[PDB]
Amino acid sequence: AQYEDGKQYTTLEKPVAGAPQVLEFFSFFCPHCYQFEEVLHISDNVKKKLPEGVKMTKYHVNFMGGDLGKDLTQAWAVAMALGVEDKVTVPLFEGVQKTQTIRSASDIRDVFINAGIKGEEYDAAWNSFVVKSLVAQQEKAAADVQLRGVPAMFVNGKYQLNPQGMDTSNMDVFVQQYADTVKYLSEK
């Protein structure tokens, strides 16, 4: 067919029940993830082509970047709790990979301060049990799919996107094939 199991996507031998409809995993340390966010804007272009009533989840992972890696997963939980993802995603990517000015939890916090989250509000969330359960949700979702690499995207806990099977001569064409593939899998 035009979309083939094993080509633009793969099928989980062990499907995950009750998984989110579209579930993306990334790391602020991950070079292709930087590309997906800052150059390709994958999450956004997928959103623009997803149907009605299909919600999108994006989670951070621990397995890159050691101690700071875990700090960033917790920081992403803060971002989700406060709803400031769109304000901190770029400065966190650039802080880790471009300028390399993120070297500690305190430097992560600075990004949120600079984006206008109040210090007391950040520190309260950081230490909150609401954020602890969000960190657990992130870990469990990754565990559920045996996640070993990023970026990764799953549709309905059953299908994993396979971008290596797509043409990358043209960025925009690549993005639409990716988005269109997510839409296809979504309607499966």
Side-chain angles (χ1 to χ4, degrees):
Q2 296 275 352
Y3 293 98
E4 288 168 352
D5 200 318
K7 173 230 286 188
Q8 294 108 318
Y9 69 99
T10 52
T11 290
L12 290 193
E13 39 179 308
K14 277 95 203 176
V16 175
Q21 287 162 294
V22 178
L23 176 56
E24 201 173 330
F25 293 94
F26 76 111
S27 172
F28 285 107
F29 283 88
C30 156
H32 289 145
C33 304
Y34 187 110
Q35 294 298 309
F36 270 39
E37 165 65 29
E38 288 224 356
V39 177
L40 302 177
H41 307 276
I42 290 290
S43 302
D44 214 61
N45 279 276
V46 170
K47 176 167 193 82
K48 301 200 292 70
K49 269 165 166 186
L50 286 178
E52 199 212 323
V54 186
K55 82 167 315 297
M56 313 198 53
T57 308
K58 173 144 55 184
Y59 287 162
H60 196 262
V61 300
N62 291 337
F63 62 79
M64 300 185 71
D67 212 84
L68 249 194
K70 282 203 69 160
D71 274 329
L72 283 161
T73 298
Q74 185 162 351
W76 188 244
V78 176
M80 285 184 296
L82 298 179
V84 297
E85 298 97 326
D86 293 345
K87 279 165 192 197
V88 299
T89 294
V90 168
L92 286 167
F93 266 119
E94 299 196 346
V96 171
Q97 294 191 49
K98 184 186 179 179
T99 61
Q100 294 180 353
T101 46
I102 293 177
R103 310 213 198 73
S104 67
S106 173
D107 303 332
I108 293 171
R109 184 176 182 275
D110 286 343
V111 167
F112 288 70
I113 301 301
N114 188 35
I117 287 87
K118 295 164 173 164
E120 145 182 337
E121 190 181 347
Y122 181 88
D123 294 341
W126 180 269
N127 290 296
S128 72
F129 290 90
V130 161
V131 160
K132 288 190 213 303
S133 44
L134 270 170
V135 168
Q137 286 168 239
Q138 292 183 93
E139 297 185 19
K140 186 197 180 280
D144 279 352
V145 296
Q146 294 76 301
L147 192 71
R148 185 180 65 257
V150 282
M153 188 180 295
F154 299 87
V155 181
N156 296 320
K158 211 165 189 331
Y159 306 111
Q160 182 176 356
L161 273 286
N162 187 43
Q164 297 85 358
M166 305 176 191
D167 190 356
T168 63
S169 56
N170 176 321
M171 324 214 93
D172 302 312
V173 168
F174 169 74
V175 174
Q176 291 330 310
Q177 185 178 2
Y178 196 102
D180 286 345
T181 303
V182 175
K183 182 184 198 283
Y184 159 75
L185 294 176
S186 186
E187 293 156 3
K188 220 163 166 64

mmCIF file of all heavy atoms in Angstrom, residues 68-90:
data_model
loop_
_atom_site.group_PDB
_atom_site.id
_atom_site.type_symbol
_atom_site.label_atom_id
_atom_site.label_comp_id
_atom_site.label_asym_id
_atom_site.label_seq_id
_atom_site.Cartn_x
_atom_site.Cartn_y
_atom_site.Cartn_z
ATOM 1 N N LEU A 68 21.206 16.435 34.833
ATOM 2 C CA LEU A 68 20.481 17.530 34.183
ATOM 3 C C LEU A 68 19.297 17.029 33.346
ATOM 4 O O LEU A 68 18.253 17.685 33.278
ATOM 5 C CB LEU A 68 21.416 18.312 33.288
ATOM 6 C CG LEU A 68 21.810 19.734 33.671
ATOM 7 C CD1 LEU A 68 22.456 20.393 32.458
ATOM 8 C CD2 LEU A 68 20.621 20.557 34.164
ATOM 9 N N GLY A 69 19.480 15.888 32.684
ATOM 10 C CA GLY A 69 18.377 15.212 32.014
ATOM 11 C C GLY A 69 17.141 15.028 32.873
ATOM 12 O O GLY A 69 16.015 15.352 32.444
ATOM 13 N N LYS A 70 17.325 14.482 34.075
ATOM 14 C CA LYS A 70 16.225 14.368 35.033
ATOM 15 C C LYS A 70 15.695 15.713 35.504
ATOM 16 O O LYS A 70 14.492 15.863 35.707
ATOM 17 C CB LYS A 70 16.613 13.533 36.258
ATOM 18 C CG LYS A 70 16.598 12.063 35.993
ATOM 19 C CD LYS A 70 16.427 11.221 37.252
ATOM 20 C CE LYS A 70 15.032 11.400 37.815
ATOM 21 N NZ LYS A 70 14.658 10.297 38.703
ATOM 22 N N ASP A 71 16.586 16.674 35.735
ATOM 23 C CA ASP A 71 16.136 18.014 36.086
ATOM 24 C C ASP A 71 15.217 18.570 35.009
ATOM 25 O O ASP A 71 14.201 19.190 35.315
ATOM 26 C CB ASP A 71 17.323 18.958 36.280
ATOM 27 C CG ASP A 71 17.896 18.917 37.682
ATOM 28 O OD1 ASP A 71 17.144 18.666 38.635
ATOM 29 O OD2 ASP A 71 19.119 19.091 37.831
ATOM 30 N N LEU A 72 15.569 18.326 33.750
ATOM 31 C CA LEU A 72 14.773 18.839 32.641
ATOM 32 C C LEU A 72 13.419 18.144 32.560
ATOM 33 O O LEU A 72 12.422 18.780 32.240
ATOM 34 C CB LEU A 72 15.566 18.705 31.333
ATOM 35 C CG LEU A 72 16.657 19.795 31.194
ATOM 36 C CD1 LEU A 72 17.686 19.373 30.163
ATOM 37 C CD2 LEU A 72 16.058 21.135 30.790
ATOM 38 N N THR A 73 13.356 16.849 32.885
ATOM 39 C CA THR A 73 12.057 16.172 32.920
ATOM 40 C C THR A 73 11.149 16.794 33.978
ATOM 41 O O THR A 73 9.947 17.024 33.751
ATOM 42 C CB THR A 73 12.206 14.661 33.202
ATOM 43 O OG1 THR A 73 12.953 14.055 32.146
ATOM 44 C CG2 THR A 73 10.837 13.982 33.318
ATOM 45 N N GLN A 74 11.724 17.086 35.140
ATOM 46 C CA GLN A 74 10.957 17.742 36.181
ATOM 47 C C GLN A 74 10.554 19.162 35.758
ATOM 48 O O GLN A 74 9.438 19.596 36.025
ATOM 49 C CB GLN A 74 11.758 17.773 37.495
ATOM 50 C CG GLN A 74 10.963 18.348 38.664
ATOM 51 C CD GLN A 74 11.559 17.999 40.011
ATOM 52 O OE1 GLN A 74 12.486 17.183 40.116
ATOM 53 N NE2 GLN A 74 11.062 18.658 41.052
ATOM 54 N N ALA A 75 11.466 19.890 35.113
ATOM 55 C CA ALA A 75 11.162 21.231 34.591
ATOM 56 C C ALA A 75 10.059 21.198 33.536
ATOM 57 O O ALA A 75 9.211 22.094 33.479
ATOM 58 C CB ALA A 75 12.432 21.879 34.015
ATOM 59 N N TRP A 76 10.054 20.153 32.707
ATOM 60 C CA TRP A 76 9.007 20.025 31.707
ATOM 61 C C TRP A 76 7.668 19.791 32.409
ATOM 62 O O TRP A 76 6.649 20.333 31.991
ATOM 63 C CB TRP A 76 9.317 18.894 30.714
ATOM 64 C CG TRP A 76 8.349 18.853 29.533
ATOM 65 C CD1 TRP A 76 7.480 17.847 29.221
ATOM 66 C CD2 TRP A 76 8.165 19.869 28.525
ATOM 67 N NE1 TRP A 76 6.759 18.171 28.085
ATOM 68 C CE2 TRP A 76 7.169 19.392 27.637
ATOM 69 C CE3 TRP A 76 8.754 21.119 28.288
ATOM 70 C CZ2 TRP A 76 6.741 20.146 26.525
ATOM 71 C CZ3 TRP A 76 8.323 21.859 27.177
ATOM 72 C CH2 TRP A 76 7.331 21.366 26.314
ATOM 73 N N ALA A 77 7.684 19.021 33.496
ATOM 74 C CA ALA A 77 6.473 18.834 34.319
ATOM 75 C C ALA A 77 5.965 20.183 34.859
ATOM 76 O O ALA A 77 4.756 20.454 34.804
ATOM 77 C CB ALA A 77 6.745 17.885 35.439
ATOM 78 N N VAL A 78 6.876 21.019 35.381
ATOM 79 C CA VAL A 78 6.514 22.392 35.790
ATOM 80 C C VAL A 78 5.873 23.137 34.611
ATOM 81 O O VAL A 78 4.833 23.788 34.761
ATOM 82 C CB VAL A 78 7.745 23.211 36.313
ATOM 83 C CG1 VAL A 78 7.368 24.677 36.633
ATOM 84 C CG2 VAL A 78 8.378 22.546 37.538
ATOM 85 N N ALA A 79 6.505 23.065 33.440
ATOM 86 C CA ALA A 79 5.969 23.740 32.258
ATOM 87 C C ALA A 79 4.539 23.290 31.955
ATOM 88 O O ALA A 79 3.660 24.121 31.653
ATOM 89 C CB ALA A 79 6.873 23.501 31.047
ATOM 90 N N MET A 80 4.300 21.984 32.048
ATOM 91 C CA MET A 80 2.963 21.435 31.780
ATOM 92 C C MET A 80 1.958 21.861 32.845
ATOM 93 O O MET A 80 0.801 22.161 32.533
ATOM 94 C CB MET A 80 2.997 19.898 31.684
ATOM 95 C CG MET A 80 3.607 19.379 30.368
ATOM 96 S SD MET A 80 3.557 17.586 30.209
ATOM 97 C CE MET A 80 4.636 17.137 31.585
ATOM 98 N N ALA A 81 2.374 21.841 34.105
ATOM 99 C CA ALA A 81 1.483 22.256 35.185
ATOM 100 C C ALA A 81 1.067 23.734 35.044
ATOM 101 O O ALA A 81 -0.101 24.079 35.225
ATOM 102 C CB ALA A 81 2.138 21.996 36.535
ATOM 103 N N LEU A 82 2.013 24.586 34.668
ATOM 104 C CA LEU A 82 1.770 26.027 34.560
ATOM 105 C C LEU A 82 1.257 26.446 33.195
ATOM 106 O O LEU A 82 0.851 27.600 33.012
ATOM 107 C CB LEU A 82 3.052 26.808 34.860
ATOM 108 C CG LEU A 82 3.604 26.598 36.267
ATOM 109 C CD1 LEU A 82 4.893 27.390 36.480
ATOM 110 C CD2 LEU A 82 2.575 26.925 37.333
ATOM 111 N N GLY A 83 1.283 25.517 32.242
ATOM 112 C CA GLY A 83 0.890 25.794 30.869
ATOM 113 C C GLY A 83 1.791 26.765 30.126
ATOM 114 O O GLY A 83 1.310 27.626 29.380
ATOM 115 N N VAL A 84 3.095 26.676 30.357
ATOM 116 C CA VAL A 84 4.009 27.615 29.727
ATOM 117 C C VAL A 84 4.976 26.943 28.745
ATOM 118 O O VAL A 84 6.048 27.477 28.440
ATOM 119 C CB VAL A 84 4.803 28.406 30.805
ATOM 120 C CG1 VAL A 84 3.853 29.233 31.639
ATOM 121 C CG2 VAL A 84 5.614 27.459 31.724
ATOM 122 N N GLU A 85 4.588 25.778 28.235
ATOM 123 C CA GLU A 85 5.403 25.074 27.260
ATOM 124 C C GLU A 85 5.885 25.968 26.137
ATOM 125 O O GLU A 85 7.065 25.961 25.783
ATOM 126 C CB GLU A 85 4.622 23.897 26.663
ATOM 127 C CG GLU A 85 4.224 22.846 27.683
ATOM 128 C CD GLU A 85 2.808 23.019 28.191
ATOM 129 O OE1 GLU A 85 2.334 24.169 28.317
ATOM 130 O OE2 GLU A 85 2.160 21.991 28.445
ATOM 131 N N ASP A 86 4.969 26.753 25.580
ATOM 132 C CA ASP A 86 5.276 27.540 24.396
ATOM 133 C C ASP A 86 6.241 28.672 24.727
ATOM 134 O O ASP A 86 6.861 29.254 23.838
ATOM 135 C CB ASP A 86 3.989 28.092 23.777
ATOM 136 C CG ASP A 86 3.101 26.996 23.204
ATOM 137 O OD1 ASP A 86 3.591 25.858 23.027
ATOM 138 O OD2 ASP A 86 1.912 27.271 22.929
ATOM 139 N N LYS A 87 6.382 28.977 26.010
ATOM 140 C CA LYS A 87 7.258 30.056 26.423
ATOM 141 C C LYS A 87 8.684 29.599 26.744
ATOM 142 O O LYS A 87 9.618 30.406 26.695
ATOM 143 C CB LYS A 87 6.683 30.765 27.649
ATOM 144 C CG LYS A 87 5.599 31.777 27.336
ATOM 145 C CD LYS A 87 4.841 32.157 28.599
ATOM 146 C CE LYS A 87 3.559 32.935 28.263
ATOM 147 N NZ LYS A 87 3.034 33.657 29.472
ATOM 148 N N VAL A 88 8.863 28.319 27.080
ATOM 149 C CA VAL A 88 10.171 27.874 27.559
ATOM 150 C C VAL A 88 10.816 26.846 26.644
ATOM 151 O O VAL A 88 12.010 26.587 26.776
ATOM 152 C CB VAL A 88 10.098 27.300 29.026
ATOM 153 C CG1 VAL A 88 9.619 28.363 29.999
ATOM 154 C CG2 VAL A 88 9.188 26.089 29.102
ATOM 155 N N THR A 89 10.065 26.269 25.698
ATOM 156 C CA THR A 89 10.654 25.216 24.853
ATOM 157 C C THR A 89 11.862 25.712 24.070
ATOM 158 O O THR A 89 12.911 25.077 24.084
ATOM 159 C CB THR A 89 9.642 24.612 23.868
ATOM 160 O OG1 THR A 89 8.643 23.913 24.614
ATOM 161 C CG2 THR A 89 10.339 23.591 22.955
ATOM 162 N N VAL A 90 11.732 26.845 23.391
ATOM 163 C CA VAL A 90 12.854 27.365 22.626
ATOM 164 C C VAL A 90 14.072 27.757 23.496
ATOM 165 O O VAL A 90 15.182 27.261 23.244
ATOM 166 C CB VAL A 90 12.416 28.568 21.747
ATOM 167 C CG1 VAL A 90 13.635 29.287 21.193
ATOM 168 C CG2 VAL A 90 11.457 28.125 20.619
#
